[PDB]
Amino acid sequence: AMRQCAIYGKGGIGKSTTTQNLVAALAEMGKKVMIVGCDPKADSTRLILHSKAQNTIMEMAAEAGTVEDLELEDVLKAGYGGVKCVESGGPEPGVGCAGRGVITAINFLEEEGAYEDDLDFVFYDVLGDVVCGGFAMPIRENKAQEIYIVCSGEMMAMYAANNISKGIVKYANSGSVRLGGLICNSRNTDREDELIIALANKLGTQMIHFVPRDNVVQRAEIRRMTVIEYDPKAKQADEYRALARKVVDNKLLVIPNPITMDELEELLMEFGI
Amino acid sequence: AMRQCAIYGKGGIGKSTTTQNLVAALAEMGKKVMIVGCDPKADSTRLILHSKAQNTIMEMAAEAGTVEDLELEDVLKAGYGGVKCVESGGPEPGVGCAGRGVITAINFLEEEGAYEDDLDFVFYDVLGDVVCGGFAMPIRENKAQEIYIVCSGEMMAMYAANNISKGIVKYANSGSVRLGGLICNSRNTDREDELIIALANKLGTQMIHFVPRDNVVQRAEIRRMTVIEYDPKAKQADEYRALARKVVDNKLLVIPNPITMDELEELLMEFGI
Ligand SMILES: Nc1ncnc2c1ncn2[C@@H]1O[C@H](COP(=O)(O)OP(=O)(O)O)[C@@H](O)[C@H]1O
Ligand SMILES: Nc1ncnc2c1ncn2[C@@H]1O[C@H](COP(=O)(O)OP(=O)(O)O)[C@@H](O)[C@H]1O
Ligand SMILES: [Mg+2]
Ligand SMILES: [Mg+2]
DSSP states (O other), X not given: OOEEEEEEOSTTSSHHHHHHHHHHHHHHTTOOEEEEEESTTOOSSHHHHTSSOOOOHHHHHHHHSSGGGOOHHHHOEEOGGGOEEEEOOOOOTTSSOTTHHHHHHHHHHHHTTOOOTTOOEEEEEEOOSSOOGGGTHHHHTTOOSEEEEEEOSSHHHHHHHHHHHHHHHHTXXXXXXXXXXXXXXXXXXTTHHHHHHHHHHHHTSOEEEEEOXXXXXXXXXHTTOOXXXXXXXXXXXXXXXXXXXXXXXXXXXBOXXXXXXXXXXXXXXXXXX | OOEEEEEEOSTTSSHHHHHHHHHHHHHHTTOOEEEEEESTTOOSSHHHHTSSOOOOHHHHHHHHSSGGGOOHHHHOEEOGGGOEEEEOOOOOTTSSOTTHHHHHHHHHHHHTTOOOTTOOEEEEEEOOSSOOGGGTHHHHTTOOSEEEEEEOSSHHHHHHHHHHHHHHHHTTTSSOOXXXXXXXXXXXXXXXXXXXXXXXXXXXXXXXXXXXXXXXHXXXXXXXXXXXXXXXXXXXXXXXXXXXXXXXXXXXXXXXXXXXXXXXXXXXXXXXX
């Protein structure tokens, strides 16, 4: 068995930082993990690889001729803790559908045998500002059974969480894609943890962890590292370890109950953000 | 003549707040303006209309049968200062292309004669996290000749500005879509104005205005108003008046020069954000 997990959320909310640090912590406990980048920014694996970024399947297929001319051992790269890394890529802005590379990448990985039984986890890092095209494909086509949404007390981030939840509900009659939890990536606002707990309860899920804002993240990422690798003694390293433990132990996977915009506005008014 | 202007930027950066306050200031000086909402969130006109939001062309066409059964006088609504307001809408998350409603809306407005000569400005408020589908259509199809990008010292917001600029460059051989400027919507970070000026210079444009972070925005929006209407004496009202003056007077419209991610990272390192 392997658990297929996807991390969704609005742009800039902390998906790639949270995913790579979460995964580094899983590797540190002895789990075998693959990260599949599903965001056109294509820097979802750089902290594991100590790299600028990673060349994408779309780019490599174009240089090789076709995606059939690519070998898995050429596209998958291993970094910290043996974590395996791949980037989908996508077309340039203004050209075609921004999520088209996700479909190509996941189909390539499936056909070429990347989902080997020894993997414990696969994490997809998915753009979540629109839920369509290849960005909806992990939900539509039952690739990510456990969705975790990174958000914050920011209204836009909560709106995005509600939008992603609506996409999960839309495909509830097939496959087994479920909402696993909300991850609060803090903006140092008071009662922010309470706010995201409240949102999770309304959706029918849970806040699996509250990730503090910590400058050690920037110091690690300037050096192309996770905090787990950069400073294993850091308080923030223990925060990601706690998040990883709770993901491993999580048993609550639900069809969420999306809320109205009135309910969202009431949440923010209540917690005075 | 009328100036067709589009406001792009990442989600939650301040597009709708900036656009509606900018437009309220234009109406206050005696300009006739239409706002076309091109973001699925569909709350781009609520501060002009004093409303929860606005029912969308996609929604109204479905209730009426076809878009041909809609009349312009039924969909366009006038609010503060006589500003005319319309929302595109879009499909629910996980269903079809999130930008499909933008194409339907702009074509409806053109055919039904919404672009009356007496208009001075049209502002499109466009989702900018992906540049594809209907969200690229104002650029691809030459609807918004002047693009203004709202951003901040946030790396994701600067990345989005660079992505939108690449889309402008892609369609430079046809039509006349141009980059008009960057609008810095502050996060109260030091040297943030300097950073966005530097980014604009590298792209070949300008920072047209630095909008401060001001709590009066939240107090106005709780009451479904622009700051211009809510507190015309506010310092922040004068900030939006200054932005509107500089948009009116702006003559620099360029084919931008997008930068590498190395150049972007160098910018942030330099200005110590
Ligand atoms: N808990 C945190 N503390 C400090 N900085 C953070 C934290 N989480 C994310 N960041 C920073 O926020 C920025 C955006 O994070 P990222 O993971 O790239 O967002 P996304 O992948 O959702 O677009 C990055 O510069 C990252 O270093
Ligand atoms: N200059 C500002 N000062 C204070 N709050 C702001 C400012 N600009 C935007 N906001 C707030 O930021 C949030 C997002 O702004 P919005 O215009 O809705 O973003 P977008 O339309 O780009 O998604 C809103 O709650 C808005 O009130
Ligand atoms: Mg990312
Ligand atoms: Mg908006």
